[PDB]
Symmetry: D3
Subunit: 273 residues, 6 copies
Amino acid sequence: LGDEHLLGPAEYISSLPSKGVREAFIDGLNVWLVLPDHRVNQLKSIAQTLHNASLMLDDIEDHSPLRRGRPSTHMIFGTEQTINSANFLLIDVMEKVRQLDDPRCMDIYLEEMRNLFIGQSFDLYWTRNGECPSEEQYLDMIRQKTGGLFRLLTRMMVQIAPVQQKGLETQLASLSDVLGEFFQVRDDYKNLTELDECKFSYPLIHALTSQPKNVQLRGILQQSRSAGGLDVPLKETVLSHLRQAGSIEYTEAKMGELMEKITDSVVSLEGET
Amino acid sequence: GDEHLLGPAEYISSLPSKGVREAFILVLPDHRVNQLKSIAQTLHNASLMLDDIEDHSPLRRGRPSTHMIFGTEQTINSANFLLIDVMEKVRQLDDPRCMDIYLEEMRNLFIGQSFDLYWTRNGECPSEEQYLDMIRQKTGGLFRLLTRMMVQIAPVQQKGLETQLASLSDVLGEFFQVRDDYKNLTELDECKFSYPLIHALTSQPKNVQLRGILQQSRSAGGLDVPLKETVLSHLRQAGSIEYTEAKMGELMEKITDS
Amino acid sequence: GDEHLLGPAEYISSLPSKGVREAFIDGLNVWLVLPDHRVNQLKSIAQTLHNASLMLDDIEDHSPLRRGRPSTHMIFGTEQTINSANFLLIDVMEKVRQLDDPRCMDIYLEEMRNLFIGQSFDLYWTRNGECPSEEQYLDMIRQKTGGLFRLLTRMMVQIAPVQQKGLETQLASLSDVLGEFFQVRDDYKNLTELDECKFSYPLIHALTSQPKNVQLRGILQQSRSAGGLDVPLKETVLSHLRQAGSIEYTEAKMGELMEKITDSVVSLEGET
Amino acid sequence: GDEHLLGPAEYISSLPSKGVREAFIDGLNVWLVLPDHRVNQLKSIAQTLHNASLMLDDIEDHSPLRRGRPSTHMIFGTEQTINSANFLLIDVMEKVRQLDDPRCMDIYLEEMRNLFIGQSFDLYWTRNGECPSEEQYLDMIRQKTGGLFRLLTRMMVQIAPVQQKGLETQLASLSDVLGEFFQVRDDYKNLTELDECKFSYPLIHALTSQPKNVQLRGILQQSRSAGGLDVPLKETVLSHLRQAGSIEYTEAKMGELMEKITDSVVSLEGET
Amino acid sequence: LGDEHLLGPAEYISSLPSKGVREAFIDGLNVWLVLPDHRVNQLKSIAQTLHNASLMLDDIEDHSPLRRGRPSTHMIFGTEQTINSANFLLIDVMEKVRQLDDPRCMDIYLEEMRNLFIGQSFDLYWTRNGECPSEEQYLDMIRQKTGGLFRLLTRMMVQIAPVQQKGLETQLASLSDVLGEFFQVRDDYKNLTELDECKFSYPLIHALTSQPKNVQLRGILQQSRSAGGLDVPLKETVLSHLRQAGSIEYTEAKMGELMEKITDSVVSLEGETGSPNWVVRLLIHRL
Amino acid sequence: DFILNSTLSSVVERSTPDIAGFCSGYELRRHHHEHLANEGSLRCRTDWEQFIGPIERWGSCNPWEGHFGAVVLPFCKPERLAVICYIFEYAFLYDNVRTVRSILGTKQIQSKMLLELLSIDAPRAEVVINSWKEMISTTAKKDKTRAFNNLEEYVDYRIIDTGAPFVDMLMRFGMGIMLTQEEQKRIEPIVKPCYAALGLANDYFSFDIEWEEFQAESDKTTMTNAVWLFMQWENLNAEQAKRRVQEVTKQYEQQYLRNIADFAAGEGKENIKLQTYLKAQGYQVPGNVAWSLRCPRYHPWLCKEAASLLHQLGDEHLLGPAEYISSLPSKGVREAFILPDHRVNQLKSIAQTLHNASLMLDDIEDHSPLRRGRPSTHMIFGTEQTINSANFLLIDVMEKVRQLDDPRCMDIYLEEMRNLFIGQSFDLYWTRNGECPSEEQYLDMIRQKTGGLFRLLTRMMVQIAPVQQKGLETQLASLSDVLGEFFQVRDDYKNLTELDECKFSYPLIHALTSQPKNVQLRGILQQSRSAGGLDVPLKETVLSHLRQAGSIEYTEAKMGELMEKI
């Protein structure tokens, strides 16, 4: 009888350093959508809890000993305990969407969570069975796996917005989608420029698509799967193979286009309001 | 694209089962009964999918487990979505009070499971009271959930019988857990404590053989046959196979009382 | 001393055999009528090549047993077995030159090139977990498994006393069909009567007809992850094969290959 | 397609090398005065043999790195690397057969026999943990790493335009002495400035001069069993070797070998 | 078939750097007891043999690959040969005790080695089963394990010493026990401030007792137990958890109390015997 | 932090530069508080009297001029001077010099001085300690018997021997400086000439007392002053011999000043740390000659006048594996091998406990999870606790042996256990390091590892039993050896007809030796060694090879011959 073993993984990950992208996003959306401070704090708590649950889960499914320079939650509590505590945070958040005083807030939650789970399922399937997805297939997974939280927060925040502003929905959903795509392409580029778990990325797909006969890359990508992780000399070989096909420049062009889209969307949004 | 999310859920819902939860399920219309049976089935499937991973069980009902056909990560993802889908099913019941019942009962279930996992991993033997309180929530949580949800969608009249039925559900869950403890040795390997084992380790505070065998079981992944017979002999000598049947008889008497 | 080099080469010879290649050599000798010592030399070449192939294959599949008895790499280690298999090629080079024919060496070279190409494709498909198509699979097993029969028959036509030369393409076709038949036979036997992630003819149809069977694809990946499958999972695979018409599609291939073999044999009775 | 068969070969060719074989051929050329085209053919043969030898040695030594770059079997797997080495041996056939000499093949076969014998003895000594005698070790290095030099030497003298009557025994002796010196040099360089428990001249001298050094044998058995030596145990082995005086014995052997190298070179220069 | 493969592990551990604490202890007690140099050398040799056997046995049951910065015995001679050598070392010591020319020296040996094994048994039991002992139980265990050699040597010297000095049994035994406690608490402090095998310690017992709800520390200890070793990030977390509860200063308080007791015992013995030792006062200065 | 404070020193007003014909280029600075030097001096004499014995020769104390510390060290901190003058007195009274009392008192004064140094400044004291080791080591063990031939080689020895590094290293303590090894290896030859001056300076005024030495007593025939060396090359009378020494001392002395001047012109411009050192050392040369001109220690006869001015829990984890192995079913044959009834029962208990400990240890070095169909001891209690209990079982057997009252029962037990451990060590070496023993070597090992217990019991019972039988010792010992051999061969035979840890058996040795070229058997044995054990077909292959070698009949011939001897 107690909660000392349930809210231990939840509290450990909540005491770690963080960036605050998910909360600055709410703060930035609060400009066009005037909201009471209580509702903004509630949404911030919901976003933080969901992000913590996601971080807890995608560490066991990535065999990552460390997290922001400190050991992972499952490495201090256990895999089963971490899973049990992460499955409970979904129920806990379910009690907070009910405190937003709107029946429609649950439909948005139950739809966007389904979308996030579909995206993560596709990611997990491509990770387990080493099938390289196409560029279009990859870009729709991360529009749900990563941009799911942004859309979820946006749609519960134009709903509690005082009357008037409900038509300004599609543009913010597109903005959230572009943000989710950009925050994953940027992470892939950062991870490569500055693998071990054999996770496909936007630069790594172009190399495997443009060069159908690259037998070295397709073998170094399988040694990682078999052994469990690449050593530094093989990582340098992967980077050298990617620097030949021009995948990095392709990633930079994609990031530039994404940023142009973000600027255009923001400009239009201030143009209306 | 929903083939890699609903897969494990379909696979585990196709294996042969007992249907005790469905057997358990007040003048209710048939449609509501089917809805509650679907909720119970999906919750049981999610519980089994999760429990198989935390016990490294390669087989279930003789057939292969879900995490040996799809992996552990996909099974975990499917279990979380199964919780979401049970949540969706509860919404269609058209009763605002099923909300709090479902959330509180799930919270109790998760607390019980967390306590069980902590006891299993850290090798700390709980007392009889702590063990009998864990299984009243981990195993009796589903029956309590179904009973409380069934009472609310029943036409008036049956409103003062919630307490009696909840007590009955708790005793029934306790009986099922103690029964599955009994019919696991007289018919551990996954470092799981039980009522006979707790009795043996409490009545014998200086028995080093049993504790050493348990420690060997911990850092080996399980016991082989001869050590299992040694454990059985120790329990039979300490009189824990017989102390268990007294609990089984007493629990049945309370069931008759309630 | 030739004691650690010839060692693994004699253990694989001492083991009981099937003698299919020797019977095949005896089979094409009625048509080509060769002297006895040349036939013995050719049978020795076939035995050496088959033994080398078996020694190499047993290592590349982690097979602790062969014909009930232990494999060569469990009595002499992996490195010595590789060395002996490497030297058996050297020995076959000396054996071929005694046949007194410049063209025999070229034939031997081209056939071994084809065999190595086929084996390389098999290894690539096995390691990377990539499912070949039916056409690609039939092309691979035609070169890897029909390579020895093709080599033997092409050397037999050259060695055989002058005159008969037009019956070369017919015999090569017969050898290729027979090799494909043998491989499909072994595949069907293994499935009906995959622990090292080997793609089979029944399995390719199963994965091609159903582009959405996630259970079979997950069991195949579990095989790779654990380096083998346990018995209930093999039963699950067999059940999945017996529900997509993959065992009944193999028998049709078997019958067509038998009809082709019979037609090829018949056509060789009117050209005598 | 040959994209999976020639992969490891081209990968190991891409890696940087030294060019000892090419320089040795160029050095013999001034005495033999071969035409350019035959010289390039011999360099191709030597390079292919060396690449195949390194490809096999990396597998049979569990070496994850080569020249600070990933090994071939870490990019293509063990089985594909073995198959590529086999095809590399099969490929050198056609380059010897394009040298336009029937006698050039018997030499190839015989020196390959000697090379495989030497490698088999090395593998036997490594696997079973048996310490060979000084003469036994010196003979095995004379055939193993003195095999390519001797093979190239005999082929060059056979191709060489006329003369070359007495220049067969002297050149062969130069070849074995050079191979022996190279093996001793590599042992010394690796030792002073193993992981796979490989025997060497300093180590054999230490185990022979001290019939009762239990610590050295225990550390060697720990290396054999565990799988490798950490830095402190390597330092302990080095301290034992310096105490026993094996390093100076090895250096004296190097000086003695270089004396005969210089004598052979001055003698050959004088005769012509 | 003569020698070797038996004394080899015993000789390798003898050819190793050592501070020589027990030898200095014997030389400092000899001023109070006054023994011939021959018997002092015999006792010193007995001490080295017993200490070396203890080190050879304890390096096996810690999975320790190195000792003093050099490879251990079981990484050079194997576990079984090291066990055989350590077992023979007890029979070898029992030949030296018989050469001390006293029937009463065997009883002391056979009754002190029993206490040593009793303490080591509890140490091993706590280590294997991951059960935290109490502070009383941990201080009693180290008074029979690390204070066993000192007490054995002390009771042996006061039996061969020329008559008169027999009444000081109690004081020289209390000194041995407090010294044995101090040498283990100091080592325990040094390891933390300056748990790969998941061994309990005074700071760790204090942390696990004072905070009965710190689920993080117990989780990391169980992780160390399961994985057979803590990485550096986890050891930093353990060290941080031991500073949030004040275990480090509790260890200093215990050390100060122990040193006060040692100083008081030495001063009492000095007023009971005569001129100052100057030899126990110096090895006290080098803590 | 390197200021040469002159306020704690007091220069002596000279008139003639020659200090009695020496040091015609230096002054002399006297220390101010020259009563800690006296205080420290007599404090050392008091402790030497109390612990070691009586003093006859004077140390370092001049009433008229002053203590050696004052004259030679002018630049020491006032509170670190008493300690220094204690080490200075210790050196003199010890180098020239019941048994237990003195040897125990010399380890007592040495630790008082050590404590004083290590309780004033720890890091500067450690460098003093190592310097003392060099001076002591270079005296006793460095071939005193060997003589000298020339001046240069004698000068090199009479540097580290006499004072110089010691006195210099003590000065830094009074100053507070420290030196890095790299720069220590730099000033090595710039201070070398200075040491020469101090050493030869002593020689001038130590020659008179040096008369009553080897040339006063023929028992010693060697000598070590430069004056006596000048007796060997030029053989001049002491007057002119010393006159040679007067000016050469200047050469070694004046040269040291020459590099001092040379140093300043060059790097000397910015060397604030080191130029302080050089100035201080230059005072030690005038200080030595000044003190060693009137000192009582070098002119004894002034005794009285010199002195006069001065005054005016429980066993539940230990006996846990020991009772489990004593509860498994047994087929005990050692009990049958075994007088008064109680003595017999004591012997049975000893044999049982020894066999139980042997089994406990053997099951660990075989990695066998099973024993007699029941789980092994280390699978219920672990390896560590089983090893700990099998180590105290020997002590328990020991207490049993003494109760079997006989002084001779101890020696038999110890020697028998020594033989048992030797046999087991050979077994373990052969098992691990893949080495095939010979037949004789194997047969000798099984005679000690397996026949050891029978020999132990027999030799105890021939001692305990009432007189009567006399010659029944060799017969029974031989019978026990044959019995142990027979039991081992039986166990080897039964393990095959009705390996997994690479254990050499009697048939296997014959198989490997009779056929020196069989590679299959050796390869399978190496596979067992590497992988960990043998699978079933591999075991059938090994048994087949043994049958073709005919090594099973060779084993049965040994059983019949052994049984015949019994």
